């Protein structure tokens, strides 16, 4: 666990965005997570049909 | 148990468990009459105990079972009465495993969020672990109640 | 996550009882044989790579499987063979000190089939290694604990399979 | 043992409004296992601490240093 | 590109029969504990060999 | 199990366009190719039992493991299965010849082998080297007949072998 | 599934109890909705066919889902779409007889999303296909248990999502 | 319930609820104040009922509770009473339901084996619900003892 | 097409693909140009197909498109005029094909389904394609309109 | 399904040689116990129901899982229960007799975990109840048979653990 | 993302042996074509805007797509239609240099549905403009790499649909 | 390839193929036949190169072939010859691709590993393809050998 | 030394000294003189365990004393047994310690870094380890030696 911790913190993606300042958030989402957030009456709105 | 606890650090870092975790591993097994000698004790005189150090208790700190105080009225008392039953059963529990992490799991991690949310006073319930402690190391012989007291001392730490 | 006497306690504390003679009993049990478990772990610890080794050449070399074409033929596919069979003998080394394979049930087996059939390792194989590691481990050990370690190494190859 | 030291790391002209100075000159504690990491990331700002100190009153031990 | 059928779980076909299997493996197919002729058909093989 | 026709109508029905020239010129060299395709797949319907039993010696004398005792051939029960896997391989790409387009064999030959063979031990690697086998076998074979372009025997064959086969970038 | 009045009695069951005051309340509480319910029931029975008519009219028709490729392109694909929103409609009712939307969970909702995913329907499009079935069917059968079917449509959304 | 049958069968046939059917439940909506009231009142005597019927059932078989049979000593006739409150509460439950389906499955399930291999005679188990069969018809109006003896009756007979 | 058919059948058998079945995929692919020539003269022409075959349905079948009916209005008549396109454009896929099963496919499973729903009169969209058939034979020969005839006649019958 | 003179022919066939000296006491061995596992066996036959009845009454009786809720509550719980038990019981004997455990593996155990953690029967409780089967059988086969049996009970619980 | 090239390479290791004559006639095709591809892979490079802004203009501008509601309405979804254009034309011409549609199955194609059914984007409209795409680069590009650039197209087509 | 090189850095960056790229990919395209040539020469001669490159390892490392190496006995010694053959192979793939890709996956991505958990000195092995790279250099023209050349010295790097 | 590692560990979680570390020190005080005992007699024996092990070492792999071989001569044998005496001195440490923490630091650390640029075999160190703990075991006392071998049998394990 500790090596792959540091391997996670330590790559470039975790440099490149959350830089050595940010605290780490949710940049992706895969698309059956949206299904479940989005997809929800109250959620849906108008997406999925004209 | 020290097993799991030394299985877990090695777990964590991808390691065929130490030479010295193995030796702590090998002195608790050997221990392992003593540690169910110590238990049985315990378990037996689970009723002298929980009834002497809930006396002490409500001595030390008669704010609890005065008005206003958690443990007021015959029902909350035996609540309470019933929680000292639990830590002592856990205590059971710890000695046999040789470590603390058993009475952690179960019962003593979140112990401050569930006794703030039902109102009862976190030091107060520490008194009457230590109450119980007492009572423990009276009816143990001075080597055992060396090392019961020290998983006593853990739950009063923790609870402190 | 359990270990036998973790397990012992954990099933009186779910019925609410403090421990029964039953229980103590139980407990005797695992105090009784961890000396044989702890000695066969650090033998195991010692000869692990060796294990491996031996099992691979017994079981998996000069084979279909390691001719080209077999899912064990490229050099990478190799390394990861090798490591997949450490994993397994490092967690069933961990089942026997705990006396419980529900170590080999949390971190090895919740997924792996899955894993197995989607990269398109052959299960059967796999299962041929792990019986010859079993052999091998046996014969390291001694006898009277490779029947221990045995319970464990089934275990991986029930859960696989 | 952990390694403190100073530097007034060159501009990464990386701000618009925002901040720079805090980035600009920097005190930091870095443990001796991870200086060399520290001293790459000195390398990618371009300049070099100002002043190196380590916490440990002694620098090498053959044995048990930890 | 040439998607998967279920999961493969390793099948074992009998390569050959032989007495002690195929008394038990009929005993099993119909759920009954071996039946006390055909066990004794096992123990003329067992008594034998 | 579409053929070149069924697979062009296919497209052009999911995007809703009429046959244009492209399509039409698409469908016209698979009917030009047709007649040779008919002939080569006669070619290896008439010979197919014995492009299956001099593919399966080719293949033992290449691998001789196979036919040893740790093989999965071994035994007469396994080597007969293994051969009708062979005929298999024949049939369903001649079908593929016939059809022009390779979605026979990956709809009902493909689909779920690689679990099958890993559940039953088969070894993969072997079976694929054996459809090779087949494919030269069946190249020759046609070009004798007289079929000029083989590229519509072989394809077929190697689809198999690529779906077949690992990666080993 | 489980109705109203089986869900209150396996609940005391469960606790081993006979039935209670506060039980019998809950029990009479269905027993009150019982006409209603009864009564949209047969409404939504004659008039199926136009619901699922009307809504698929409201959301699904002329959109990017019946152009081709669109999914429900095909008279094949129409077909399917109009028969799965009658399933959604039948069962719904069931639900709305009922008081429990077990039948939801038993007979539609469990492995629906896996299928639909493997199939690749559009789940946005169902969701708003269902919704717009709950605009009819509450102009159909009242406001009242019209309350009461977007429960239960509701409980399919939320399944289905 | 009559509600599940209903929605079971129709389920099966894949048929909105015929009309048949949608005017059975209502009038099992009708009815289920009636029945309400006889679980109450059988639920409010269920001391009464179990207590004497229990009796009857003891004096008729003696054998039953004599020492070798199942219910020898107090610990296992207690238990035998038990048996016997709990077809009342299963009983209660079929009467509020309209129909056997909930007795039918929490228990005259599978209660020749469970019995069976428990030792006890299941037709002595019979006329135990026999007599507490009447003492409900004698707690009960005419009527209302008729379905209550229906259900009853539905236990009896997978008893047998 | 003629293709599958053999090559499914075939497979069905579990025998290689007979003789016959080869000659009969033979005729096939060498009468593809006639089948191309065919398909590409409907195509080409599908604007004058689709115009004059709706105002033959359109004058046939007049309360279709009157006030109230199912074409009634501007957008309405301009869709059912694209579902005599969508048909005209399966029977090209078929006419190319050589069998109705790419027509079949695509449409003629659930027709009655789909207009029922959408409230068609079906014997109307029969005639409409009836329509397509008069007008189409006309811009082939007397031989090559025998051929398209078939695929435009399935899929009346059908609709049917 | 493998007997143990399956498994010892096929090793030797695989290998290729004639059936060694050493494959021949593994036999010998099997062969020289046959009357004893065919009189265990019969012993069983007779007495299963009651075995069952003792383990039962031993661990589960009078217990929190006979409570109300306790998952052998309802009397379809407690039947199937009593019948997993005889499972467990005729198996073991089937795999006594063939001398292999490989009728536990491809019958009862490739399926156990998925069936048991679907339903959430208590894993637990019936590794308890197969190991009071174990001690009772033992009884009434005699040690021999107690310790051959035994190692096939112990399969099947350390197979659900 | 296999090539030709490498594609020819991988099956002749798999079969294990070295590089064939026939493997070496299938090369020089690859070569052969090489010119072609690349000039091709040059004019789409240069044009890439331009392919997608005559694409978007032809099919998707001035519609209801456009307008509100439509899924391309909101200047965020209008920028992230566009993005997926250049997506599809980008790893089309990753394909044709390649010789290979592995590109586009493992990493364009890859839950593209799943993806689009989830966002509510119109999978039937985004055929239609990767169509006009197709077209678009088919004027460009010659009927050479068009009918190349067309399989790869169609290939998107296919499996988005 | 170098295509899928310059393709998978491309699309690492999310961009069209660079001009310089396509003109790599333009060179490598046009010599093409240059490679298959150099790849055709190796394929003719690997008989010969193993055998030489072998005796010559042998003679430089003899502990490998002496008792207590990897490879002692003709059993161990033709296996150790094989993975020689092997190298050869994954060299003229390379030369065929134009990249050291097909060479990184198939064989020199753990090889550390393989190897060690082998028990076999991977320097050894280096000291092979040195061998085998100047028998390659005799059996190559000049200006191929050193493009040859290459792909064997990426072999020993990654060895060594 | 375990207090110390029991120290740091407990300062990382701001804990006092937790009952289960309390005891491992409160034991390694208690063994201390055992600890002693054991590296005094190892230490009298120190020259003969390391000269007889390296024999033992060049026995068992003649490819270490053939030609190729790093210990080539007899200054490079000199450095191979100075290398089997430096890991005697280490567990010598390390059993006083009660830890591997010192064995750890002093010498295991990069120990595959370091060899390979040497050019070393690890395994051959491996084998000559295994010997040594052979011979440390029979010097030593057979129930103190079984302690001993755990911390070899730690550093033979982390050499690979
Ligand atoms: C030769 C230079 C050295 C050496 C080698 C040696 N190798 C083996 C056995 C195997 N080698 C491999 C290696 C590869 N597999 C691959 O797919 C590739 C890349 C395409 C490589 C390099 C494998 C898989 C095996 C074993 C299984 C097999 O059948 O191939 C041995 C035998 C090991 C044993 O104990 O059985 C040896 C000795 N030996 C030397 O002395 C050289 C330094
Ligand atoms: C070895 C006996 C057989 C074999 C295996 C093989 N496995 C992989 C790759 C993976 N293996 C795993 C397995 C595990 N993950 C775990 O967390 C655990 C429990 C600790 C296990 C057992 C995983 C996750 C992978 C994926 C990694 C990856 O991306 O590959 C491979 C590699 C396949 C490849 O193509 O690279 C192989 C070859 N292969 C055999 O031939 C043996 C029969
Ligand atoms: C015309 C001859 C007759 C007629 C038809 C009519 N149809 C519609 C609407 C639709 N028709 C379809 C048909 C198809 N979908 C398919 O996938 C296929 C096969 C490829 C066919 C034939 C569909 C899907 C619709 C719905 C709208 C849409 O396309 O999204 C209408 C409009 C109905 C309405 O009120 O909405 C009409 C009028 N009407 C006539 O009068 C003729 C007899
Ligand atoms: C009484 C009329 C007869 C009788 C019964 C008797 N029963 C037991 C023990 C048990 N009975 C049950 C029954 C049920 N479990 C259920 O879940 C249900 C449905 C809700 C029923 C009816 C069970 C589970 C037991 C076991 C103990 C337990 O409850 O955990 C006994 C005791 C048996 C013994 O010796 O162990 C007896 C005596 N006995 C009679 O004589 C009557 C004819
Ligand atoms: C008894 C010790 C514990 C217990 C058991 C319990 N089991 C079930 C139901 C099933 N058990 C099985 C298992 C098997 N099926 C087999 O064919 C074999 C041999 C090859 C085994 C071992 C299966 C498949 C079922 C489900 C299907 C069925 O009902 O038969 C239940 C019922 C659960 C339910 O309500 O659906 C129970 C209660 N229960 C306990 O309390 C014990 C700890
Ligand atoms: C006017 C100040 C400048 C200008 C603009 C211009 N825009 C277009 C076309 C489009 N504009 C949009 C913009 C939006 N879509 C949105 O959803 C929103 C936010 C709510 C905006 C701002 C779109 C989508 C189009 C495409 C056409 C369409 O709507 O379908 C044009 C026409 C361009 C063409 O060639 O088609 C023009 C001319 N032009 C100017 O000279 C001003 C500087």
């Known amino acids: ?11 470039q993606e975790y440099s490149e965005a959350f830089g050595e300042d940010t605290v780490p958030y949710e940049r992706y989402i895969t698309p059956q997570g949206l299904a479940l957030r989005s997809l929800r009456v109250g959620t849906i ?3 999925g049909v004209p | 148990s020290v097993v799991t606890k030394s299985i877990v650090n090695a777990d964590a870092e991808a390691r065929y468990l130490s030479p010295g975790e193995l030796d702590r591993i090998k002195n608790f097994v050997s221990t392992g009459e003593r540690r169910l000698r110590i238990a049985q004790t315990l378990t037996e005189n689970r009723e002298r105990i929980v009834k002497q150090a809930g006396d002490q208790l409500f001595q030390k700190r008669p704010d609890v079972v005065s008005p206003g105080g958690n443990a007021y009225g015959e029902e909350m008392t035996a609540t309470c009465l019933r929680d000292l039953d639990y830590y002592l059963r856990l205590v059971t529990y710890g000695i046999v495993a040789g470590d603390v992490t058993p009475i952690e799991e179960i019962g003593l991690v979140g112990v401050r969020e569930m006794y ?38 853990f739950v009063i730490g923790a609870m402190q | 996550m359990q270990d036998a006497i973790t397990a012992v306690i954990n099933a009186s504390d779910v019925q609410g009882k403090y421990l029964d003679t039953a229980a103590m009993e139980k407990l005797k049990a695992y105090f009784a044989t961890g000396e044989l478990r702890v000695r066969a772990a650090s033998v195991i610890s010692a000869n692990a790579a060796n294990i491996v080794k031996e099992a691979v050449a017994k079981s998996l070399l000069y084979s279909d499987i390691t001719r080209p074409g077999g899912n064990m033929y490229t050099t990478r596919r190799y390394a990861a063979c090798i490591r997949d069979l450490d994993y397994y003998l490092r967690y069933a080394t961990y089942a026997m000190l705990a006396g419980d394979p529900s170590i080999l049930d949390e971190r090895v087996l919740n997924g792996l089939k899955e894993t197995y059939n989607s990269l398109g390792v052959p299960i059967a194989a796999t299962v041929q290694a792990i019986q010859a590691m079993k052999e091998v481990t046996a014969s390291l050990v001694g006898a009277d604990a490779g029947k221990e370690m045995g319970i464990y190494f089934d275990y991986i190859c029930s859960g696989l399979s | 043992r952990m390694f403190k030291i100073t530097a007034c790391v060159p501009s990464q002209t990386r701000i618009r409004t925002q901040r720079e100075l805090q980035n600009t000159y920097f005190t930091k504690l870095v443990p001796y296992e991870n200086w060399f990491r520290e001293q790459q990331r000195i390398q990618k700002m371009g300049g070099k601490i100002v002043k190196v100190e380590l916490f440990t009153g002694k620098p090498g031990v053959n044995t048990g240093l930890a | 590109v040439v998607k998967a059928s279920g999961g493969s779980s390793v099948a074992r076909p009998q390569l050959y029969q032989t007495v002690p299997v195929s008394t038990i493996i009929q005993a099993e197919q119909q759920d009954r504990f071996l039946n006390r002729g055909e066990l004794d058909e096992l123990a003329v093989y067992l008594r034998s060999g | 199990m579409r053929d070149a026709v069924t697979t062009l109508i296919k497209n052009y029905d999911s995007t809703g366009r009429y046959l244009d020239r492209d399509a039409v010129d698409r469908l016209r060299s698979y009917f030009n190719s047709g007649a040779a395709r008919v002939k080569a797949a006669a070619v290896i319907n008439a010979n197919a039992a014995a492009i299956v039993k001099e593919a399966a010696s080719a293949l033992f004398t290449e691998q001789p493991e196979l036919i040893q005792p740790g093989g999965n051939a071994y035994t007469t029960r396994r080597y007969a299965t293994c051969l009708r896997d062979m005929d298999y391989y024949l049939r369903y790409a001649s079908y593929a010849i016939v059809a022009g387009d390779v979605d026979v064999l990956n709809e009902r030959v493909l689909e779920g082998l690689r679990e099958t063979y890993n559940s039953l031990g088969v070894p993969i690697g072997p079976t694929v080297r054996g459809i090779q086998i087949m494919k030269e076998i069946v190249r020759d074979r046609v070009a004798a007949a007289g079929i000029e372009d083989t590229g519509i025997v072989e394809q077929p064959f190697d689809y198999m072998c690529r779906q077949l086969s690992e990666v080993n970038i």
């Open chain 1, 1 to 11: 666990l500790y090596g792959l911790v540091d391997a996670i913190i330590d790559s």
């Open chain 2, 116 to 153: 703030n949310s039902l109102g009862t006073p976190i030091p107060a319930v520490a008194e009457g672990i230590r109450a119980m402690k007492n009572v423990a190391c009276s009816l143990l012989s001075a080597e055992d109640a060396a090392e019961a007291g020290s998983y006593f001392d």
């Open chain 1, 45 to 47: 709105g108008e997406t």
